[PDB]
Amino acid sequence: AREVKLLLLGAGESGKSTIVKQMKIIHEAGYSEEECKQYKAVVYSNTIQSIIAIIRAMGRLKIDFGDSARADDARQLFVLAGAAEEGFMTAELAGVIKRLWKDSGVQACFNRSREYQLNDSAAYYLNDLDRIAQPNYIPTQQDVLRTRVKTTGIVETHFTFKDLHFKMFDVGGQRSERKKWIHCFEGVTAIIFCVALSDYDLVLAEDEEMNRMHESMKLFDSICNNKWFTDTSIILFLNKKDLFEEKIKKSPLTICYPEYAGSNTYEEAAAYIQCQFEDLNKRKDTKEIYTHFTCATDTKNVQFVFDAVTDVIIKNNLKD
C-alpha cells in the first residue's frame, strides 16, 4: 500500500479546517456550484456573527461610536440577526452592517482585536459586503474557504495525488466517538502542526496561564517528543504569515517573548519563532522538523507547500 496518513494538529483557530477544505479545492475537484449555494446561509451567518462580535466588544472595551446615530443600527442588528437564516440579506440588513462597518468607533475596535476574540474571516467578509449583499449571489470558492463551520467530530478528506492515496484527518476537539478519535493518532505518516503566527500579540486572557503562542508551544513540545511518534514526520506550518507581517510592523515580538533582543522585521521575527518551536524537539539527531511558512487561505501557497511536503514523503519511502 502506497497509502499516506496525515494528521492535522494545532490550537483552535490555527488553520486546520482551512487546510482540509484546501485539499478539496486543490486535489479533489473543488466545490460544485450546488455546494457553493449551500454555503450562502453560512457566509451570511458568519458576516452577521463577525459584526456582532465587534459591536459587543465595544461595550466591554468602552469604545463610543463615531456617530451616535449608529446606536440604532446596533439595536437593529440584533432584531434582524435571524433575517437571513434560510434566505436573503434583505436590503435593510445590508444597510445596517454597511453603515456600522464604516463607522470609526467600530473600526477603532476592529484595530484593537488583539484585546478580545475576533475571528479572522471578519475583515474578509465585511469588506466584500456589497458583493455578497446581491440577491443573485453565489459564493465563490474563496468564499467557501473562508466559511466558519462548527464540527462536532472527526473531519476527514482523501485524495490521490502523485500516485499515492492520501488520508487526512483534522481530529478536532470532540472526544465523543473515542476509539475512532484515538485511531487518528495511529499509523500516521506525518503530523502537520499548525501555528497562528498572528497570535503572538494577543493579550494574555483571564483564562490563560501563559500566552497563546506558549500554549501552542507546549502542545508542540508534547506532540514532537511523544514516543509514539518516533517514526512519524513532524511538519510545522507556521501559518497566518500574511497577518503576522502586518502586525509585526507595529506590535513588537517582545509582547510575546520579552527576552527577544532582535528586531521587528517580518524576517527576523519569523525566524525567531521557528527557533522557539524547533528548539522544543529533544531528539535532534534522530529527528528533524519540516518547517513551512504558510497563508492557509491562499490556495496557490498551500498547493506549493503541500507539493513540497509530498516530495519529502516520496524521497522518504525511497529507503526501499
Binding site: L9, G10, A11, G12, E13, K16, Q38, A41, V42, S45, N46, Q49, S50, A53, Q117, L118, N119, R148, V149, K150, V171, G172, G173, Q174, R175, I182, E215, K218, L219, S222, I223, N226
Partner: peptide, 21 residues
C-alpha cells in the same frame, strides 16, 4: 496528560462565531 491537552487545546475556537451545517 497528552490526549487531554490536545482535546482542550483544539476545542478552544470561537463557537459564537461559527455555525452548524
Amino acid at each position: 496528560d497528552f490526549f487531554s491537552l490536545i482535546l482542550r487545546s483544539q476545542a478552544k475556537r470561537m463557537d459564537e462565531q461559527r455555525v452548524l451545517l
